[PDB]
Amino acid sequence: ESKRNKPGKATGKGKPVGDKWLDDAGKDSGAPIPDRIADKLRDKEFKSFDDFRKAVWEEVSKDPELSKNLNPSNKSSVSKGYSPFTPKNQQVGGRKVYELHHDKPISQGGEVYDMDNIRVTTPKRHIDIHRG
Amino acid sequence: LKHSISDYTEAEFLQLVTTICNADTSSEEELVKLVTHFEEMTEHPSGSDLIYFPKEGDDDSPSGIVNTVKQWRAANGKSGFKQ
Ligand SMILES: [Zn+2]
Numbered sequence: 260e261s262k263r264n265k266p267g268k269a270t271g272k273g274k275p276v277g278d279k280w281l282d283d284a285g286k287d288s289g290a291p292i293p294d295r296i297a298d299k300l301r302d303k304e305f306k307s308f309d310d311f312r313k314a315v316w317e318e319v320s321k322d323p324e325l326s327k328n329l330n331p332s333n334k335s336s337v338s339k340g341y342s343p344f345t346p347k348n349q350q351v352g353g354r355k356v357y358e359l360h361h362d363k364p365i366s367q368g369g370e371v372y373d374m375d376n377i378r379v380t381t382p383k384r385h386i387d388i389h390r391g
Numbered sequence: 392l393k394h395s396i397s398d399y400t401e402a403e404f405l406q407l408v409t410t411i412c413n414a415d416t417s418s419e420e421e422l423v424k425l426v427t428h429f430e431e432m433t434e435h436p437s438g439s440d441l442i443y444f445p446k447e448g449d450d451d452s453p454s455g456i457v458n459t460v461k462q463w464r465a466a467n468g469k470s471g472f473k474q
Contacts, residue, residue, distance in 0.1 A: 330451055332442045335414035341422060347438040355423055355439065 262365050263308040271374035273297035278328050281357065281379065285349050288388065289360050289378030295322055297374045308371055312359055313340035345381045354382035396432050396464065401457065401472045404432075409453040411442060433460050434469060 274291035276283075283290035292315070299318045305311040319325045320337040333343040342356035360380045363369030370376045380388065392398035399407070409415075411429060416422045430438045441459060445451040449459065464471060 330443055330445065332412045332414070332451065335412060336419075336422065339414050339416075339419075341414065341419040344426065344439055344443045346444050347440050350439070353423065353427070355426065356419070 263371055265371070266304060266306050267372045268302055268304050269297075269300040269311060269372045269374060270370075271297055271301070271376070273374050276325075280325065281328065281343075281345075284345070284357055284379045285381040285384045288362055289380035289384060292374040292377050292379070293322075293325060295324070300374065305372060308359075311372055312342070315359070316340050316342055319343075349381035349383045351382040351386055354386075356382075358382060358385045360385050360388065393428070395470070396460075397470045397473055399432070399472055400474050401461070404460075404472060405453060405457050408442075408456050412453045412456070433464070435460060435463055 271292070273294040273296060276291065276293045280290055280293065296315060296318050300311075300314055303314070305314065316337045317340045319329075320334065320340075326334055326337070329337065329343055336343050342358070344350075344356050358380050360378045361369045361371070362376050362378055365371055396404070407425065407429065411422070411425050414422055416425065426439050426442065429442070433441070435441060441456055442451070449455065461472070463469075
C-alpha cells in the first residue's frame, strides 16, 4: 500500500547536536538525526519506517547526552520506544509527540531510511512545513 | 469513575498519574489517551506540561503532580476530589 512500509537498511551520517536538540524541532526544517544515533542504527534492517522510529527513540533512551534533557516521565516514554511528548504549545489536537519528517518527501523519491533525509519536528512545525 | 476530577478519590487520581509517569501502557496510543484524559480532568492551563515540562523547581514525581493539581484546583474555584 505504502513505500514507507517496505523493508530497508538505515544509512547516513546525521549531525552533532547539543542540549537544545529538541528545541530545534519546532523551527526551520526541524532538528537533524544526531550523529551518535546514526552510528548505532547504520546498516540495521527495518521492516517499516515505524520500526525505524521505535529504534530511534530506544537509542535516545540509552544515550546519556540525549536522555538527560528529558524529564523522568519523558524518559519512561522513550524507554518503551515511544516518541516523547512536546511542550503543550507545540501540540496540535491529538498530535502531542515529536514527529519524524522526511526532508525530501518519499512521494517525490526521498529516501525512507537515510538519516540525512530525516528530521525531528514538533506537530505544529511538521503541519506548517507540509502546508509550505 | 472517569468523567471528572470529582469522580476520583485522591488515591485513584494518584494511580492514574503514576501510570502516565511510568508510561505503563501497551501502546503509544494508550499513553496519549491517558494524557488527554488528564488534561481534560484537571483543566489546568499548563496541560501535559505538568507531567513533562515542569516549571523550575516544581516536583514532577507522581505525588508532586497530584499536589500541584490539588492546590491549583482549590485556589481557582474548581471542584475537588471525591471523599
Ligand atoms: Zn514530513
